Design a protein that fits this description.
Chain B: This is Splicing regulator SDE2. Chain B is mainly alpha-helical. Chain B is built from one helix and no strands. Chain B has one helix spanning 2-24. Chain C has helices at 2-7, 10-13, 23-50. The longest helix of chain C is centred in the last third of the chain and has 28 residues, at 23-50. Classes of the chains: A mainly alpha, B mainly alpha, C mainly alpha, D alpha/beta.
């Protein structure tokens, strides 16, 4: 019964944002699963709406996040996000939000997949938004092959990230890779440093790691480099 | 000093080098 | 730079992290440990809240 | 590999039976009417796990199981209602030695085929490439030949089989000298990819209109791919839920045609789409129609990167490492461009060498190392060498280097002299 004034308002005037907000506020007083079915019906009617998808996923996450970590209801919200990615296209907000929400679930496998699908979906400009979160995500795991491939991509946009990659290789004990990159950097004298380090100091740091570690460093003619 | 900085750094590093060197040899 | 950009296949973007296979157990094993730590924290937070 | 799909290699089950003399052919399907090619064959492999390698002069018994071939006839899934979705089929009846060459060449390791004049060297080679392509679509076969002439004839026969031209790439001098109107050069493939992208998006535009979906789904590969994900798959799952009864009633054959949401899109296909003869026949057409649709967006998804790459230049080498599966090149080009190919991160699983007896040792060697090892492991699984060491060696102009340094000895001929097993 009580749906029918708002249903008539919405079906006669689908572009009336005020009529949508009126019914959403009405459903906020109602029990919230019917609001989710409203959003299901609303997105069937108006999938291109930025406002409908953003509010739905915000409401979905805020309800579910208090539940048990293993609860299937999180996968329902995920299925909404999958559908959200389909309609919304260029709008950055959902791409960021879903990856963050899967980190809250600890779903490492699916978080990477959503990053990898975001990179596949969108231009390099959108990638530049993705990579700060994704590299910060990749560092937090013992997944060095994935982080190596991710770090490499950023370097031709961000030279300062090569310092972060060398520091990542140092902390991952991948000193042989770190020696290869830093020797390339020391030859690439146009390099830019967040510490402002000189090319002599970078070469010094190169020799600091190398002279400590003849065993680990193996791809390089150490004698030639120091001569 | 620039010169003495390398003196203090390598003095500690040589002892580490001798320790790891005897292990490798 | 154009010669180098021409080389850039999706290897550089990294997407064979799915397809190399062995990464997926490595991802799953850390995900299970992370999930376990999160569940224990979530229980501990509920226990502190209840107390 | 115990179980291999041989696809169109066998024209019939009788051809298969003739191709394995002294083997017991056990067909999994008892009904002779269903024993139609293609055939998947599981060969019994002597697994190394077991008895420690001792008492080898005890001759292993002629156990009937060891000669029993398990043959699985299977039907190629319908690819769609249009005539061009039908797979091209081999027409050559290979001999048992040729079938043995095809069998061995599909296996990991070294396969050597000694091919006398007129024994179907080129024909065996094309069938090996096709079989690997269908069994292992993720794997890549590197074709290396001594001459443009050998390269052309091999490439042209490959085009006559059910192989997608997008994976075919010719690299060399004389890329234009193919007797085909299609440009298989690096730039030519880009032209192909860009034209095919536009054509497939117009199919999406027809599909969007036929589904009554508002918007512009055909604007980009991004819009097209997501159009498929919601609009095709929800309508498909609705269709599947209506026709695949959730209850104990036999499905009505008319429901297949009635609920089919893509009738208007396939209105330009040969009519009638559904025959109304049996539920299974029309459903495989319906699934095949969906497979036709699914194929289009699969190519568009692959081409989505070529949209994002702004220059046509960058596209060509992007194709080279991942998209192109069957890469045909000369030895001379392989030598000259090894430095470039290694730098580009080129990777391949299989090498097929035609006329390997006419290639110098060093020129034969260079194709093995056109890829960097992966973690110290070579990606190379299969090396197929096809040649005739009783025909001409490589041409050496200096008679002294030819005779006294053995420079006319080919690597193929050397392996025969060392005694590596050959399929004659």
């Amino acid at each position: 019964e009580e749906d029918l004034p708002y249903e008539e308002e919405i079906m006669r005037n689908q572009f009336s944002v005020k009529c949508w907000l009126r019914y959403i506020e009405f459903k906020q007083g109602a029990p919230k699963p019917r609001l989710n079915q409203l959003y299901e019906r609303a997105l069937k009617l108006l999938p291109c709406s930025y406002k409908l998808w953003y509010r739905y996923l915000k409401a979905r996450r805020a309800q579910v996040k208090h539940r048990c970590v293993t609860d299937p209801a999180y996968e329902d919200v995920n299925n909404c996000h999958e559908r959200a990615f389909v309609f919304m296209h260029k709008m950055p907000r959902l791409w960021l939000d879903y990856c963050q929400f899967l980190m809250d679930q600890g779903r490492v496998t699916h978080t990477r997949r959503t990053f990898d699908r975001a990179l596949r979906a969108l231009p390099i400009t959108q990638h530049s938004r993705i990579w700060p979160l994704y590299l910060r995500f990749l560092r937090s795991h013992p997944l060095p092959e994935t982080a190596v491939r991710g770090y490499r991509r950023f370097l031709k946009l961000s030279p300062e990230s090569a310092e972060e990659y060398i520091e990542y290789l140092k902390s991952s004990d991948r000193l042989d890779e770190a020696a290869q990159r830093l020797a390339t950097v020391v030859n690439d004298e146009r390099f830019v440093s967040k510490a402002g380090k000189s090319n002599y100091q970078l070469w010094h740091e190169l020799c600091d790691l190398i002279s400590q570690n003849p065993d680990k460093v193996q791809s390089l003619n150490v004698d030639a480099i120091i001569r | 000093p620039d010169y003495q900085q390398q003196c203090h750094e390598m003095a500690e590093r040589l002892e580490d080098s001798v320790l790891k060197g005897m292990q490798a040899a | 730079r154009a010669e180098l950009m021409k080389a850039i296949d999706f290897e550089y973007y990294g997407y064979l992290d799915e397809d190399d296979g062995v990464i997926v157990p490595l991802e799953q094993e850390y995900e299970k440990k992370l999930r376990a730590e999160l569940v224990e924290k979530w229980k501990a937070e509920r226990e502190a809240r209840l107390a | 590999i115990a179980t291999l799909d041989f696809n169109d290699t066998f024209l019939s089950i009788e051809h298969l039976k003739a191709s394995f003399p002294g083997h017991n052919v056990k067909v999994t399907v008892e009904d002779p009417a269903l024993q139609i090619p293609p055939f998947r064959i599981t060969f019994p492999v002597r697994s190394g796990k077991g008895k420690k390698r001792k008492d080898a002069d005890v001759e292993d018994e002629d156990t009937e199981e060891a000669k029993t071939l398990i043959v699985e006839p299977h039907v190629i899934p319908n690819r769609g209602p249009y005539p061009y979705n039908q797979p091209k089929r081999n027409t050559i009846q290979f001999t048992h030695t040729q079938i043995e060459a095809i069998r061995a060449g599909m296996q990991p390791g070294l396969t050597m085929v000694v091919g006398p004049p007129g024994t179907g060297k080129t024909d065996v080679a094309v069938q090996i490439i096709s079989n690997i392509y269908h069994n292992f679509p993720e794997q890549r076969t590197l074709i290396v030949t001594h001459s443009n002439q050998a390269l052309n004839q091999l490439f042209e026969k490959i085009m006559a089989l059910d192989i997608d031209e997008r994976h075919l790439l010719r690299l060399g001098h004389g890329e234009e000298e193919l007797e085909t109107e299609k440009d298989f050069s690096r730039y030519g493939r880009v032209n192909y990819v860009l034209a095919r992208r536009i054509e497939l998006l117009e199919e999406v535009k027809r599909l969007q209109k036929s589904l009554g979906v508002p918007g512009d789904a055909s604007y980009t590969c991004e819009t097209a791919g997501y159009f498929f994900l919601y609009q095709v798959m929800s309508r498909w799952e609705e269709y599947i839920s209506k026709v695949k009864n959730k209850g104990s009633t036999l499905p009505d054959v008319t429901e297949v045609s009635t609920f089919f949401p893509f009738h208007e899109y396939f209105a330009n296909a040969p009519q009638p789409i559904f025959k109304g003869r049996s539920y299974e026949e029309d459903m495989e057409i319906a699934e095949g129609c969906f497979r036709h649709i699914k194929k289009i967006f699969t190519q568009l998804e692959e081409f989505r990167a070529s949209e994002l790459l702004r220059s046509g230049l960058d596209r060509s080498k992007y194709l080279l490492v991942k998209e192109a599966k069957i890469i045909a090149m000369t030895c001379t080009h392989a030598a000259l461009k090894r430095h470039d190919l290694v730098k580009l991160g080129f990777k391949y699983d299989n090498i097929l060498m035609e006329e390997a007896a006419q290639i110098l040792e060093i020129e034969t060697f260079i194709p093995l190392l056109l890829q960097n090892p992966q973690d110290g492991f070579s990606r190379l699984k299969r090396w197929i060498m096809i040649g005739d060491h009783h025909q001409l060696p490589p041409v050496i102009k200096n008679m002294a280097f030819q005779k006294y340094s053995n420079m006319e000895q080919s690597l193929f001929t050397r392996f025969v002299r060392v005694g590596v097993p050959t399929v004659d």
